What we know:
2 chains of a larger assembly, Alpha-Beta Plaits, rna binding protein/dna, about 30% strand, 2 domains, elongated
Amino acid sequence: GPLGSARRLYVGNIPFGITEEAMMDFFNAQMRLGGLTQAPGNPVLAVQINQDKNFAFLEFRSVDETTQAMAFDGIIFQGQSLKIRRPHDYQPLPGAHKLFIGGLPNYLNDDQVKELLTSFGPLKAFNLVKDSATGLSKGYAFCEYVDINVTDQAIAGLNGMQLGDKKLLVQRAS
Amino acid sequence: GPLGSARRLYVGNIPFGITEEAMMDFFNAQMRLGGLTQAPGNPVLAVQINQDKNFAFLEFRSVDETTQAMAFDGIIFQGQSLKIRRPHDYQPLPGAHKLFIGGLPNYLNDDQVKELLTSFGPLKAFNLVKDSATGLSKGYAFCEYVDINVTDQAIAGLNGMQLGDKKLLVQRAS
């Protein structure tokens, strides 16, 4: 559900034949050296490795230290650049990464506006604000990407873009 | 596999008439004497002797204790200095010849993908990546050949191969 999977991370591309204990020791050391722990001790409680598919799950003692550890994405461990991700069944709460899109040409419809946005990735929410009487577009919209990592990319990619005789505004909605 | 040979050592210059049990007793005793063991018990599980060519293979219970026993090069057994080496198929970088196979038609099952691969020789490791929910192939796999020398010829043969709808990508998984 909404609050599940908040103290685990997926780690891909792990070193061949690495032990769970060695991985645990590596991450606990890095958490401490990097200043990512929030209290004395080791944030990583356990590592479960799938050897056949070469990935691991890390289990953390707290929700906030799990979040901090996302910063280790790409860290080199015994020659391998580790891939660090959220569990697939972890999700931010609804609207956490809502985008406002303003300055759209009023004659474009829903599908036409989404075409610009979905070029960065799939959307879990979208609405183009329209005058409810006439049904006409007011030239601004909101959306949310399925993958919340995409949010900063769409902003970097679309904000301030020239579009007709307007500059697009794309920013986090709150 | 890439570790099966990480637990063996070559022993050369063995005295005439030596038995496998006497060889095993000698190395276990040497291991314990040098304090090179990382657990109670005997690190050497078995020895196989070729009396005709005066060499033997030692099989160890662990990768680290095998590495420790490299220090025994030159050791005196029945008056003779023993030659100790890695097996020729030893892999200093484990997993260096693991392959990634991408662009597989997504209806192909395990056996079918393997049949594509084994025309170059036998595999010691294989896995086709599937969605755990549906059981459906994600369209890529990993393998490793029994004989690593086959690897590049497999890449030469399979990389870029047209496979119905798709084109294969075969490369070291790195």
